[PDB]
Coordinates of C-alpha atoms in Angstrom, one line a residue:
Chain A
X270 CA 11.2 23.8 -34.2
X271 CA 14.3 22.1 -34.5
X272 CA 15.6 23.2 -31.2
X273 CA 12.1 22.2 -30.0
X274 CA 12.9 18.8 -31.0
X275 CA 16.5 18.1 -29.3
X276 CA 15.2 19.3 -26.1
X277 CA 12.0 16.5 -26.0
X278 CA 15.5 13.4 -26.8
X279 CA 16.8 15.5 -23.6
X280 CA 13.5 14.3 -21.8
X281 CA 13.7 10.8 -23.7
X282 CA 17.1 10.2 -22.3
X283 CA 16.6 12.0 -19.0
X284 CA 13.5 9.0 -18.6
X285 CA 15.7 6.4 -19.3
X286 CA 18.6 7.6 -17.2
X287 CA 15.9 6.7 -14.4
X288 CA 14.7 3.9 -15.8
X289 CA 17.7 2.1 -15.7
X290 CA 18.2 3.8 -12.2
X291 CA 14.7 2.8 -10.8
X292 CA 15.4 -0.8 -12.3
X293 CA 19.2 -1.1 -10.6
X294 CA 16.8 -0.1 -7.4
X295 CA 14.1 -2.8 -7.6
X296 CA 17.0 -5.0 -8.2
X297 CA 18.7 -3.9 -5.3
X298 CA 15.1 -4.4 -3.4
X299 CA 15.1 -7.7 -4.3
X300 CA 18.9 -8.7 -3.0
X301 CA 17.9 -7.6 0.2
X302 CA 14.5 -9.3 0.3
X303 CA 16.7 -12.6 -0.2
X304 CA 19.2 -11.9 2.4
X305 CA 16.6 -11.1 5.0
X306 CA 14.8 -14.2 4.4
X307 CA 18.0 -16.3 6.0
X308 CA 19.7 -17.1 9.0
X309 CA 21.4 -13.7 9.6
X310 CA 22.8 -12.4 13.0
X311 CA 21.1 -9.2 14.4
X312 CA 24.5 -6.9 13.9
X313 CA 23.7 -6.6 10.2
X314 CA 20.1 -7.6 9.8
X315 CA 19.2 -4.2 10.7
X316 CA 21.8 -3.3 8.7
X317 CA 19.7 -4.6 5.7
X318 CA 16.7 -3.1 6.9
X319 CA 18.8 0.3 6.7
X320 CA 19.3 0.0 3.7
X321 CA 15.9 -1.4 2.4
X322 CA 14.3 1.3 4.2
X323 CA 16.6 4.0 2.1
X324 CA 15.6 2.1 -1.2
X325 CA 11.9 2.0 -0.9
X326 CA 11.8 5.4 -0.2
X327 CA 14.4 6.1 -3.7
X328 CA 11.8 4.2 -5.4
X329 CA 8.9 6.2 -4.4
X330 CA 10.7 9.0 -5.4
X331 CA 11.7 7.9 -8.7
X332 CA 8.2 6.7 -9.2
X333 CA 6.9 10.2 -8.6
X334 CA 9.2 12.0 -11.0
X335 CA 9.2 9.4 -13.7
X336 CA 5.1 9.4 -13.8
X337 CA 5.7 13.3 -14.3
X338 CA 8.7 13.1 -16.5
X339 CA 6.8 10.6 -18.5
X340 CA 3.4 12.3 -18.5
X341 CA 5.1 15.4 -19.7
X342 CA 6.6 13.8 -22.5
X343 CA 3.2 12.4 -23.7
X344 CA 1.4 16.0 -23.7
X345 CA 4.6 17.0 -26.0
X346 CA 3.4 14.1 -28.6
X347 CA 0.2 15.4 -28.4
X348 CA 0.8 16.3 -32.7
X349 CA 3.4 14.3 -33.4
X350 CA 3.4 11.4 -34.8
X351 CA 6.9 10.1 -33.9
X352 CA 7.1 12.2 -30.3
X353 CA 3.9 10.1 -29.2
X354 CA 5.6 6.6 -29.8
X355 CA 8.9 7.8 -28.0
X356 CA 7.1 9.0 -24.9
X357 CA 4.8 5.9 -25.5
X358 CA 7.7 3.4 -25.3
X359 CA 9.0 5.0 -21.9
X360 CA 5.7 4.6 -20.7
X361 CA 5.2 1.0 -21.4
X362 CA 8.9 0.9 -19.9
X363 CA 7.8 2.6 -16.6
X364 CA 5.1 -0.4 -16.4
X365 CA 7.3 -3.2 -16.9
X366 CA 9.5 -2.1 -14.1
X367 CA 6.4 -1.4 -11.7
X368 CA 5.2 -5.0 -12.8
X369 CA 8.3 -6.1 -11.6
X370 CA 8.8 -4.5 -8.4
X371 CA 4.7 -5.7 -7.9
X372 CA 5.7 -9.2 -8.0
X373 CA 9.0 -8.9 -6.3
X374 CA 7.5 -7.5 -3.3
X375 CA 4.2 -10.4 -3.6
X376 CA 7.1 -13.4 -3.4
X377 CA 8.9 -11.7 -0.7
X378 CA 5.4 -11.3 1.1
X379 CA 4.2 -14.5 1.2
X380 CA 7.8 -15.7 2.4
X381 CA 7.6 -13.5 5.1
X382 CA 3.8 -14.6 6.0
X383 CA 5.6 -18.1 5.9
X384 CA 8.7 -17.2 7.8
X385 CA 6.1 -15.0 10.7
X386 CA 4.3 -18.2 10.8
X387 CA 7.3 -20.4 12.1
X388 CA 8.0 -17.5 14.3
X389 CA 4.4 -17.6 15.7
X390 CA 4.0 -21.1 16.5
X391 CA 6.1 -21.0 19.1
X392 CA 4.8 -18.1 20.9
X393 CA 1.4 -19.4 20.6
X394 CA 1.8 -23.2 20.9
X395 CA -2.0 -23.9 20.4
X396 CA -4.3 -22.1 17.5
X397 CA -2.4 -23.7 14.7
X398 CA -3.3 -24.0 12.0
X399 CA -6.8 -22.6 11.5
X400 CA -5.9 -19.9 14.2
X401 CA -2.1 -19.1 13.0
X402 CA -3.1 -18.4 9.7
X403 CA -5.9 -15.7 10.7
X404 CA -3.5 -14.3 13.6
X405 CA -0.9 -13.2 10.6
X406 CA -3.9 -12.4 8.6
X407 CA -5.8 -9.6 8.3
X408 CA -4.3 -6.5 10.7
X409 CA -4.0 -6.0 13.5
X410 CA -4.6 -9.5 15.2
X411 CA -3.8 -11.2 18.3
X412 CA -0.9 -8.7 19.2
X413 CA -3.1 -6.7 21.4
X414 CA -2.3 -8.3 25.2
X415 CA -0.8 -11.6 24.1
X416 CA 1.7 -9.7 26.6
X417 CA 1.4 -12.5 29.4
X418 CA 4.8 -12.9 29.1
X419 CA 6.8 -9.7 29.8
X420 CA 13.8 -14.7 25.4
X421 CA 11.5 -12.3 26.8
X422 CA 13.3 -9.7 24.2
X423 CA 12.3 -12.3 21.0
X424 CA 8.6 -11.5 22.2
X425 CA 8.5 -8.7 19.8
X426 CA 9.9 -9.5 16.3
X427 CA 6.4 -11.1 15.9
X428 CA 5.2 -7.8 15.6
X429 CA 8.1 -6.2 13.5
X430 CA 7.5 -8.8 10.9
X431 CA 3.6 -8.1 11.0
X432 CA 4.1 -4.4 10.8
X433 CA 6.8 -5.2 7.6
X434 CA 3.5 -7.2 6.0
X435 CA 1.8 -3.7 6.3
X436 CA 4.7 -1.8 4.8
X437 CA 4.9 -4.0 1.9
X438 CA 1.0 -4.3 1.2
X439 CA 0.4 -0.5 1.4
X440 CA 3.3 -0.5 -1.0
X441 CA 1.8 -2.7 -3.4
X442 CA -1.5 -0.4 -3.4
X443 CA 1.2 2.5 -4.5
X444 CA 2.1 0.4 -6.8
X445 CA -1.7 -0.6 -8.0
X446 CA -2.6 3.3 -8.1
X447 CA 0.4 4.6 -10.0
X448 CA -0.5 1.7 -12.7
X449 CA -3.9 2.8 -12.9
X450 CA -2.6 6.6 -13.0
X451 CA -0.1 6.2 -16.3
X452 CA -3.0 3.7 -17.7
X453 CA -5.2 7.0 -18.0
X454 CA -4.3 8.6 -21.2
X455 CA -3.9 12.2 -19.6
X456 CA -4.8 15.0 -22.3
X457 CA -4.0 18.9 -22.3
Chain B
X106 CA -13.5 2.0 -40.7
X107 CA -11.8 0.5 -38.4
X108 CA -13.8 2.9 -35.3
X109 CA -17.0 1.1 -35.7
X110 CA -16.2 -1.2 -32.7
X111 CA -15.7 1.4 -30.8
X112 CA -19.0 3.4 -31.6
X113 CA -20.9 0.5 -30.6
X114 CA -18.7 -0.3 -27.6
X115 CA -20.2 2.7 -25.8
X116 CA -23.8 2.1 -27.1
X117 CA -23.4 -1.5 -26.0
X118 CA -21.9 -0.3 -22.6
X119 CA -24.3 1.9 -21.7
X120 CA -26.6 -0.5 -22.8
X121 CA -25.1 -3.1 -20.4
X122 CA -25.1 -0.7 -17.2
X123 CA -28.8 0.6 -17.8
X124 CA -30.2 -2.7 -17.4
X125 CA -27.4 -4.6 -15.1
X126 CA -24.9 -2.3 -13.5
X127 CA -27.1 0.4 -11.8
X128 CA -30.0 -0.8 -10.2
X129 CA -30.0 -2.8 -6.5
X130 CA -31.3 -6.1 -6.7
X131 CA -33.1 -8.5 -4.2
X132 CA -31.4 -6.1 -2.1
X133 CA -27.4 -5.8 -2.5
X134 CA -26.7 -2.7 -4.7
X135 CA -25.4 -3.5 -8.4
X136 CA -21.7 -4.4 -9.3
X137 CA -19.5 -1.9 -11.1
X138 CA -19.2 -2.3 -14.5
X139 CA -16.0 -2.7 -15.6
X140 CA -15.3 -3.7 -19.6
X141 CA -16.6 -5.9 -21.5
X142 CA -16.7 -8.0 -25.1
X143 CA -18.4 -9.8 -27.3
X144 CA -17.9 -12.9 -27.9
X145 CA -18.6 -16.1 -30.3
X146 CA -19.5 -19.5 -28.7
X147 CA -20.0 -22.8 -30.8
X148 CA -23.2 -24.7 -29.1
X149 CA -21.8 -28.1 -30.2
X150 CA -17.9 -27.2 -29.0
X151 CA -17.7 -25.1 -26.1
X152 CA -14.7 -26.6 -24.5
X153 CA -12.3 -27.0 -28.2
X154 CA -11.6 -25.1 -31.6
X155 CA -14.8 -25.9 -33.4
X156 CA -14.1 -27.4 -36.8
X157 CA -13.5 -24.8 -39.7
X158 CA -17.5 -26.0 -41.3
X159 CA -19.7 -25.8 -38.5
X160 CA -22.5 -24.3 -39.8
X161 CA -24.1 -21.3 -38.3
X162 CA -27.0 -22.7 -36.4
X163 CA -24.1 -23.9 -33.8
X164 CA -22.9 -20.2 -33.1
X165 CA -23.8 -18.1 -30.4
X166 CA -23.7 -14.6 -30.0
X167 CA -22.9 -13.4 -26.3
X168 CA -20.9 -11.1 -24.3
X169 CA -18.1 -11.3 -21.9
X170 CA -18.4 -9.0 -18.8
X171 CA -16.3 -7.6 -16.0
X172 CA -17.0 -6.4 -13.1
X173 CA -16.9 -6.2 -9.0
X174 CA -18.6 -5.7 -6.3
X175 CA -19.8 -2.3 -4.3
X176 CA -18.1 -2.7 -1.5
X177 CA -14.9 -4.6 -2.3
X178 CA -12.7 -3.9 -5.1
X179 CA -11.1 -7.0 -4.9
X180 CA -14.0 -9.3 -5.5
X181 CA -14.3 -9.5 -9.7
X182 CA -16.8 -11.4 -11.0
X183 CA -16.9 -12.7 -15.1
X184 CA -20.2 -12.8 -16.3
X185 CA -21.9 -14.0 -19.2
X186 CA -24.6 -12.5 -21.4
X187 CA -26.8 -12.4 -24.7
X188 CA -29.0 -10.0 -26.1
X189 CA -32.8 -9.7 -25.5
X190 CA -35.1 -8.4 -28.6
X191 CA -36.1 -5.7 -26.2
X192 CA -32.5 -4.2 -26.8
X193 CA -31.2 -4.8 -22.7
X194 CA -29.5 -8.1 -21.5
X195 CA -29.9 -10.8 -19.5
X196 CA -26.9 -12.1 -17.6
X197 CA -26.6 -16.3 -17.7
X198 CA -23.2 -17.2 -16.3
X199 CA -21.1 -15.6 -13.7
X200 CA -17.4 -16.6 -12.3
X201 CA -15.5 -15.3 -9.4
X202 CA -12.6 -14.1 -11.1
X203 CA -10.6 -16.5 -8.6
X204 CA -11.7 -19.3 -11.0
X205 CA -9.5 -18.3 -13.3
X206 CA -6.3 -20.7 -13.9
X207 CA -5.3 -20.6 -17.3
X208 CA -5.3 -18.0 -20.0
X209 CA -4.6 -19.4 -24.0
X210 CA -4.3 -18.3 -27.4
X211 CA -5.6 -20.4 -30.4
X212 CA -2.1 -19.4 -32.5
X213 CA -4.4 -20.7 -35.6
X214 CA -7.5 -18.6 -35.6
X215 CA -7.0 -14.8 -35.1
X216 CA -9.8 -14.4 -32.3
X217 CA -10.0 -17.7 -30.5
X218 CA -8.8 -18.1 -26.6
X219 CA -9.7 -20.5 -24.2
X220 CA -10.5 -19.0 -20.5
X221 CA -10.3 -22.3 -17.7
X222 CA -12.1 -22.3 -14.6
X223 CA -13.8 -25.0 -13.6
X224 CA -14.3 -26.3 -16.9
X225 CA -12.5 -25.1 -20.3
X226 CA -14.4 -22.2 -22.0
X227 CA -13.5 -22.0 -26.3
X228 CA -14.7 -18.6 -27.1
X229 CA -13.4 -16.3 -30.0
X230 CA -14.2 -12.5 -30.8
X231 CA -15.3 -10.2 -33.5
X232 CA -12.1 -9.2 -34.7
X233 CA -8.4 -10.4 -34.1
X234 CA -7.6 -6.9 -32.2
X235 CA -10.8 -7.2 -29.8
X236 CA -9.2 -10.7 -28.4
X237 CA -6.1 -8.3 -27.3
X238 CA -7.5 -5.7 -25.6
X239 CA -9.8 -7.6 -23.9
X240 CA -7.4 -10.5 -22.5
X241 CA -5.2 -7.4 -21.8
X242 CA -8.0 -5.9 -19.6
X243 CA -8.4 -9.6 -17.7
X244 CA -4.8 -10.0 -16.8
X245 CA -4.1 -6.7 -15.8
X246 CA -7.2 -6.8 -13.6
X247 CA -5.9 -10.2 -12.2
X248 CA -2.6 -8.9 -11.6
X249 CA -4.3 -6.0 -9.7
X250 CA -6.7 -8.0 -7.6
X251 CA -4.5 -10.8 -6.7
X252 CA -1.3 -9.5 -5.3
X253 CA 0.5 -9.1 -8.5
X254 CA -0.3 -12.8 -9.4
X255 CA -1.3 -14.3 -13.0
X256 CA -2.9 -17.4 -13.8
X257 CA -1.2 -20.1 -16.3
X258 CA -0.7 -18.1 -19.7
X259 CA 0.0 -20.1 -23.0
X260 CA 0.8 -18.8 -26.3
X261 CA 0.6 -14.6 -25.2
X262 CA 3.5 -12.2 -26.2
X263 CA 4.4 -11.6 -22.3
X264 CA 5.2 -8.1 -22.9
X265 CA 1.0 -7.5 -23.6
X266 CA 0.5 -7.4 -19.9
X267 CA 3.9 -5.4 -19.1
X268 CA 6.0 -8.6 -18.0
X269 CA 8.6 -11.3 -19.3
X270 CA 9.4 -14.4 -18.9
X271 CA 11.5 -14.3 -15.2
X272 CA 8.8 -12.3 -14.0
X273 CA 5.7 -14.2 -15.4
X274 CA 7.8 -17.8 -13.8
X275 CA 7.9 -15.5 -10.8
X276 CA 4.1 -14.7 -10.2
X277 CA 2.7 -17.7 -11.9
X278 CA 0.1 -19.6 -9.5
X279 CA 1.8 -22.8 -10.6
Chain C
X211 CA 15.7 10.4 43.2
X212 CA 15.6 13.4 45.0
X213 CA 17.3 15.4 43.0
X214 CA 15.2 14.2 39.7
X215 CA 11.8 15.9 41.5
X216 CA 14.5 19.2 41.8
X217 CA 15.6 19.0 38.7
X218 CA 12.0 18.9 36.3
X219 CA 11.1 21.7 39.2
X220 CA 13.9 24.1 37.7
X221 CA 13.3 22.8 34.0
X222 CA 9.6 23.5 34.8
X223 CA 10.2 27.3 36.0
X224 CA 12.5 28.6 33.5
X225 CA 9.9 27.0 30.9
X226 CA 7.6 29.4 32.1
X227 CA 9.7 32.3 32.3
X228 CA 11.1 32.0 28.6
X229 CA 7.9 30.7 27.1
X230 CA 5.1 30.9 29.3
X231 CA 5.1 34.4 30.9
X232 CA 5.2 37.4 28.9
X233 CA 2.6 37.9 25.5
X234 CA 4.2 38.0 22.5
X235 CA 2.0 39.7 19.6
X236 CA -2.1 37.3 22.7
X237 CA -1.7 36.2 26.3
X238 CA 1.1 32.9 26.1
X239 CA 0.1 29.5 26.8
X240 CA -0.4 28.1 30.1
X241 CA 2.2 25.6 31.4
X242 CA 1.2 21.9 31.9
X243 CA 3.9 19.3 31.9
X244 CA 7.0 18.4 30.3
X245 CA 9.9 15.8 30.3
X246 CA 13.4 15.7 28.8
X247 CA 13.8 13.7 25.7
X248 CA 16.6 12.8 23.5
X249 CA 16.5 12.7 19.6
X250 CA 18.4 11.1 16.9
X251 CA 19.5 13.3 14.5
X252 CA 19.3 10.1 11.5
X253 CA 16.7 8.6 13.3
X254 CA 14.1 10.0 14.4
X255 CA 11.7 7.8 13.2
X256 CA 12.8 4.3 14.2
X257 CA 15.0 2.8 16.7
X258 CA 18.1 3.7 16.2
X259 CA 21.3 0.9 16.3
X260 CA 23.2 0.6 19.8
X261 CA 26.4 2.0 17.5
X262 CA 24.6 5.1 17.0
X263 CA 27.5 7.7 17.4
X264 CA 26.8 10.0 20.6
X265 CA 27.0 13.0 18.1
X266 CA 24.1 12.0 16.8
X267 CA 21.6 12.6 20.4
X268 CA 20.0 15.6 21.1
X269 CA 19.1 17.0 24.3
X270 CA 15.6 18.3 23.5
X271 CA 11.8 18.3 25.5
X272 CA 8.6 17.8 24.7
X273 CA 6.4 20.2 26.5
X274 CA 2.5 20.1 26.8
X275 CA 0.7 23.6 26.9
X276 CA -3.0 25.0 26.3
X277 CA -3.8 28.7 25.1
X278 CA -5.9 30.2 28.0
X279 CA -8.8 30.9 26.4
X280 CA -9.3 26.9 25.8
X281 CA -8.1 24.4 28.4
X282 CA -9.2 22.0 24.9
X283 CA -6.4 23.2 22.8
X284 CA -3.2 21.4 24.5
X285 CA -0.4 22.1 22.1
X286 CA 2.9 20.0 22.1
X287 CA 6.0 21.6 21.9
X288 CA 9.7 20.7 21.0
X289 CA 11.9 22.7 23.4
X290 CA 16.3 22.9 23.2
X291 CA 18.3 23.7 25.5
X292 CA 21.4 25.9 24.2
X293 CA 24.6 26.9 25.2
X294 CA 22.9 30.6 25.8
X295 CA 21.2 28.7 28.8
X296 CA 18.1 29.8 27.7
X297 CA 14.9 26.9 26.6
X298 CA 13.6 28.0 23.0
X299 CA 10.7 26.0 21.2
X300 CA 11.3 24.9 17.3
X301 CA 8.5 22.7 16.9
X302 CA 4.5 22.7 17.4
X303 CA 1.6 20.0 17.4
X304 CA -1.9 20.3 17.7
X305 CA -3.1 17.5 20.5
X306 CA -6.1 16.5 17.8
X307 CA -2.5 15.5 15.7
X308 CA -1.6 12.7 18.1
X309 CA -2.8 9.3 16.5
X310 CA -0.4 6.5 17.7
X311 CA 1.7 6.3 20.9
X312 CA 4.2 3.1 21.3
X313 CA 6.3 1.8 23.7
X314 CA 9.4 0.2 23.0
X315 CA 9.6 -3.2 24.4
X316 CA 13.5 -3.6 24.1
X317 CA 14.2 0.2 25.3
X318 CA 12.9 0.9 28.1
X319 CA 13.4 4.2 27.8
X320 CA 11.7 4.9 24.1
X321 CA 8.2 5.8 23.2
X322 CA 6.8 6.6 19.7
X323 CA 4.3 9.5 18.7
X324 CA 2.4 9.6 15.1
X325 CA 1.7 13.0 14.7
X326 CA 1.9 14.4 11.1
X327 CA 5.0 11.6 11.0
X328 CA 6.3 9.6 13.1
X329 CA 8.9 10.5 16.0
X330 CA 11.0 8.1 18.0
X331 CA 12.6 9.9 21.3
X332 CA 13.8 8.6 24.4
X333 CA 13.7 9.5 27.9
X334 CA 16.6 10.0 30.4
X335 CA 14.8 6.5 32.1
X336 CA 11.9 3.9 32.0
X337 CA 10.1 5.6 34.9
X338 CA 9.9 9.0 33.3
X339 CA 8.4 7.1 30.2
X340 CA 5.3 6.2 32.1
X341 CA 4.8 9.7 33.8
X342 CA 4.7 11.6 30.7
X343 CA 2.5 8.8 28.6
X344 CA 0.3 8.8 31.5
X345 CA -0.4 12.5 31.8
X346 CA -0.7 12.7 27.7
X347 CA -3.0 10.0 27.6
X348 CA -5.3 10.9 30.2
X349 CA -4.8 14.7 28.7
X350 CA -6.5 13.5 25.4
X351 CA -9.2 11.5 27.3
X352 CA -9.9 14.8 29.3
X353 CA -10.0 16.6 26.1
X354 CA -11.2 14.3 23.3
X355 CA -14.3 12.9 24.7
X356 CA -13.3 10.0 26.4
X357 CA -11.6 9.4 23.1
X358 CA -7.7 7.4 23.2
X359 CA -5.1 7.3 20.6
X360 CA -4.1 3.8 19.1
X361 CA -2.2 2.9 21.6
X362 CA 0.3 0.2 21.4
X363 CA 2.2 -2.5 23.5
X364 CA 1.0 -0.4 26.6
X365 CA -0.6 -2.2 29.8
X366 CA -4.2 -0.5 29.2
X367 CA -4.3 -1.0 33.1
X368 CA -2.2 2.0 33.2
X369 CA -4.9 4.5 32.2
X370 CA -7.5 2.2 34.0
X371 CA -8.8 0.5 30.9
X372 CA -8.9 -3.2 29.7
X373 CA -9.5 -5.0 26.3
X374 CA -12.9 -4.0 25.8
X375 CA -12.8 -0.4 26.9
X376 CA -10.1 0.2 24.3
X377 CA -11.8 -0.8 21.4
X378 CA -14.9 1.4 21.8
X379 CA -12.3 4.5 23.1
X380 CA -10.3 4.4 19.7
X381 CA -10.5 6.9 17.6
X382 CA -10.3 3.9 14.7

């Protein structure tokens, strides 16, 4: 009906109200991905990690509604021509925008493989650079009783930068699987 | 018709797992099949655009598969195929999906692109619209596999493969 | 000192006597251990920043009992202490939950468990750490055939274990 119709433009614009919201988020990812990535004092370097750590878990929660919101829009366009392309264009929308977090959190990975590598050489004068590059590499590694050395407090950012690399790899397989999941065409 | 293509899409891809993509070997199991294509190849120009009047003796008929291995997901291999008389097919040529560098369209002929590994590869498809969706399939399973990378694209409408141009200068190997 | 062995000794009887005594329909559980923690109400999942407000701690302990019809079935608990001067438990685990312990190597006072999520507490000092990560490990080797959690940034020494007997004790 014609009521039936307005209510589907309510989902339209309800989609790209967190569009634009989960793109201002990646954006905001990617600010502090630059900041962490220099010279900053400890006082508000883990206040950068507070606030990356609130806006990963906003994106995974606007990635959960919007591959519903979205999905539910595509069932609606099921027998409609025009209702279809609409819930179509907000699904190639939501791709773009997991693309783009994808590759945002790939540069920032390798940077901080690069920037745990500097850290490493010095805690591990030998190994390099056949040996550094597979200690970073490949969880977990050479953490387990490199503890010789009870500067002693600098000992164990090694290992909060390691554990970041898993954090931002199992976030990238979210990523993989929820691009797979609005790839499948889901019918009802 | 225009759903031909697809009718024999399925025929071919069973075709393709019966005799390639289901049986172990000699023995690591088979690979998964993935998608696949077929292709044109010009004997006498492999590497360029073939010239508009090469006659038909110089074409080729094969196929373009994808697929990886059992036990790791993130090990794609490109194959290349023709068709035997006895209806299965015989794979010739296969790449580690690693190879893969540089991705172009021919903007003059509708189903011509040029894959580059180790050497430059001219191939062209069956129909302008089977070039998209397959070259769509390859970068999206590149940007999968590899960490959200892509290899060097020329001439593509960015937005195909759900990117534009800050993010493509972003995850670009080069 | 002193009065720290006096002061888990009443903590340890008036556990028993509000949770551990009377059934409740099932006999109760039979008392093991315990040790006093505190929690961060933001944080209880990481370490929390040296200007953490004080009004965000809480004075809670994490007990360790086992229904007596299975010394197997160690349960851990979450017990507060309220202005009613009475201990009351708001929170359950099943032992076969614990997957990860960590030690903080900055604070010595904080240790991390990986249940269903993860849980960052801290003890009232470094010494009490050790006590209660000793007695919970070696309770889930007792238990758990032989079997460890991942343990991490902990002298394997501790539980008389080394490099190689770690690897093959992991439940990973």
């Amino acid at each position: 009906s014609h009521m039936d119709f307005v209510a589907f433009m309510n989902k339209i614009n309800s989609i790209n109200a967190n569009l634009s919201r989960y793109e201002n988020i990646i954006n905001q990812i990617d600010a502090q991905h630059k900041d962490l990535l220099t010279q900053v004092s400890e006082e508000q370097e883990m206040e950068l990690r507070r606030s990356l750590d609130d806006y990963i878990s906003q994106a995974t929660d606007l990635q959960y509604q919007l591959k519903a919101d979205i999905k539910d829009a595509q069932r609606d366009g099921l027998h409609d021509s025009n209702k279809q392309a609409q819930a179509e264009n907000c699904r190639q929308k939501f791709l773009k925008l997991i693309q783009d977090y994808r590759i945002i959190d790939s540069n920032y990975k390798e940077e901080s493989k690069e920037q745990a590598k500097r850290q490493y050489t010095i805690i591990q004068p030998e190994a390099t650079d056949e040996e550094v590059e597979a200690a970073i590499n490949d969880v977990n590694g050479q953490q387990i009783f490199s503890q010789a050395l009870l500067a002693k407090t600098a000992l164990a950012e090694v290992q909060a930068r390691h554990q970041e690399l898993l954090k931002l790899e199992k976030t990238m397989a979210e990523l993989t699987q929820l691009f797979n999941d609005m790839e499948e065409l889901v019918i009802e | 018709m225009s759903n031909f293509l697809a009718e024999q899409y399925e025929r071919d891809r069973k075709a393709i797992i019966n005799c390639c993509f289901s049986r172990p070997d000699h023995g690591e199991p088979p690979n998964n099949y993935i998608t696949h294509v077929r292709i044109i190849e010009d004997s006498k120009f492999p590497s360029s655009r073939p010239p508009p009047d090469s006659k038909l003796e110089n074409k080729k008929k094969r196929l373009l598969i994808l697929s990886a291995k059992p036990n790791n997901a993130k090990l794609i291999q490109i194959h290349k195929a023709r068709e035997n008389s006895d209806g299965s097919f015989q794979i010739g040529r296969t790449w580690q999906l690693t190879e893969l560098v540089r991705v172009e369209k021919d903007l003059e002929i509708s189903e011509g692109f040029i894959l580059t590994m180790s050497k430059k590869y001219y191939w062209e498809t069956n129909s302008a619209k089977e070039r998209t969706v397959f070259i769509k399939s390859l970068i999206t399973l590149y940007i999968q596999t590899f960490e959200g990378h892509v290899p060097e694209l020329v001439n593509w409408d960015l937005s195909l493969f759900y990117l534009d141009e800050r993010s493509y200068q972003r995850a670009v190997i080069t």
